Design a protein around this nucleic acid. Sequence first.
DNA 1: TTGCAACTTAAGACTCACTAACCCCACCTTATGCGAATAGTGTTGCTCATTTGCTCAATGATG
Length: 126
Amino acid sequence: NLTKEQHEWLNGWLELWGAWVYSGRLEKRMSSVIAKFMESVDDDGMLISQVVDSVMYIDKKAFGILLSYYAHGSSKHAIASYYHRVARPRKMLCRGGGRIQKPSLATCRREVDEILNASLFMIYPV
DNA sequence: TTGCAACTTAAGACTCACTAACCCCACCTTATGCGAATAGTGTTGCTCATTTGCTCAATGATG
């Protein structure tokens, strides 16, 4: 797990990073997913963009979520809201049981939280 | 003779008019503007209860 100084440090880096990118100052060549986000609208931001694209290159879903939170500046609650909207029925050993249904909102909140913590966790040493 | 109870007539207000069924249609709108207040609703960090999977723990049944 990361610490909280690392949280605030790299948090501020992703704040100026997403504020830098979202103005449109980044090129297509960094990612086609970064290009995808730029279809939906300095060396610091390009260095970090190589970092974040390098680590979060492989998932692209939480990478897009990461752009939604930092580049766009969206609240966590709306992200888990739409994410609960796009939910499919899954197998979970629930408080209810191992039946197969669409999960609750608070579960989706937990998932945005843990994909946040794991995302930041995988970014930080890079 | 005169008042007075008593009888008579008339005027007026209220109630009230069979039982069941089927079909159709018609149903009810015009100041602006501004600030203040409030309700709502949005976000987030943080609980609490509840089902399963699973492990210990013993005890008589069995090899």
